[PDB]
Design a protein around this ligand. Structure first.
Ligand SMILES: *[C@@H]1O[C@H](CO)[C@@H](O)[C@H](O)[C@H]1NC(C)=O
Lengths: 171, 55
């Protein structure tokens, strides 16, 4: 993908996280588990829902609209009618197929972006108190219990609190 | 030539008579006279389709 994460440096998805599009898996002394990142998931859901709704919404309804009939000395106007209907059919078929193609690409790319940005967000919180594995995972140089983990997940991680300890294990 | 046994022909004509107006028929032959007519209320954007599907 454009942003290199999904089907990228993170090879695959997690069938074990059923409650969100994006999130975290942790393992520590207290136990192990998945937790969805609520904010990014909900932002993406709202965005994509707005996209679909906006595609559907722009088709102001067709009010009652019908085919025309013609007598045997009206072939030219009948053909004008057919030219109009066929022409509109060409335009709407091309536009619908191509639009769906391009927007599908954009949606997938949007997800890839959201994953990369969540990863870099966590990365920028943790800095050198953890080492990047490379597969989307971070390994702590300090003990990080459940409260600490949740602090990481909600962006309230306290770097100075664990910096000295981290520095101790890193060296 | 004959169609449905008849070498004669009949032409059919119609008109919409507006409210309050009068239509007058005069003839010395050949008139197929109105017997029943239809008073109409108008409405837009419909049309006719051909289908064998059940209503
Ligand atoms: C995030 O989690 C930490 C640790 O439990 C907590 O202290 C903090 O209040 C939480 N912040 C939010 C956004 O609720």
């Amino acid at each position: 993908g454009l942003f290199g994460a999904i089907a990228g440096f993170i090879e695959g998805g997690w069938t074990g996280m059923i409650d969100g599009w994006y999130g975290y898996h942790h393992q520590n002394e207290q136990g192990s588990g998945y937790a969805a990142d609520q904010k990014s998931t909900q932002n993406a859901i709202d965005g994509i829902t707005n996209k679909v709704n906006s595609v559907i919404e722009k088709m102001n309804t067709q009010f009652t609209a019908v085919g025309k009939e013609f007598n045997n000395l009206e072939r030219r106007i009948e053909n004008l009618n057919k030219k109009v209907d066929d022409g509109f059919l060409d335009i709407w078929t091309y536009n619908a197929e191509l639009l769906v193609l391009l927007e599908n690409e954009r949606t997938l790319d949007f997800h890839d972006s959201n994953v990369r940005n969540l990863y870099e967000k966590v990365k920028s919180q943790l800095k050198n108190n953890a080492k990047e594995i490379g597969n989307g995972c971070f390994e702590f140089y300090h003990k990080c219990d459940d409260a600490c983990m949740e602090s990481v997940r909600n962006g309230t991680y306290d770097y100075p609190k664990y910096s000295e300890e981290s520095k101790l294990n890193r060296e | 030539p004959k169609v449905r046994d008849q070498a004669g022909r009949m032409n059919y004509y119609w008109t919409l008579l507006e409210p309050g107006d009068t239509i007058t028929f005069e003839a010395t032959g050949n008139l197929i006279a109105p017997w029943y007519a239809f008073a109409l209320n108008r409405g837009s954007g419909s049309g006719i389709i051909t289908s064998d599907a059940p209503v």
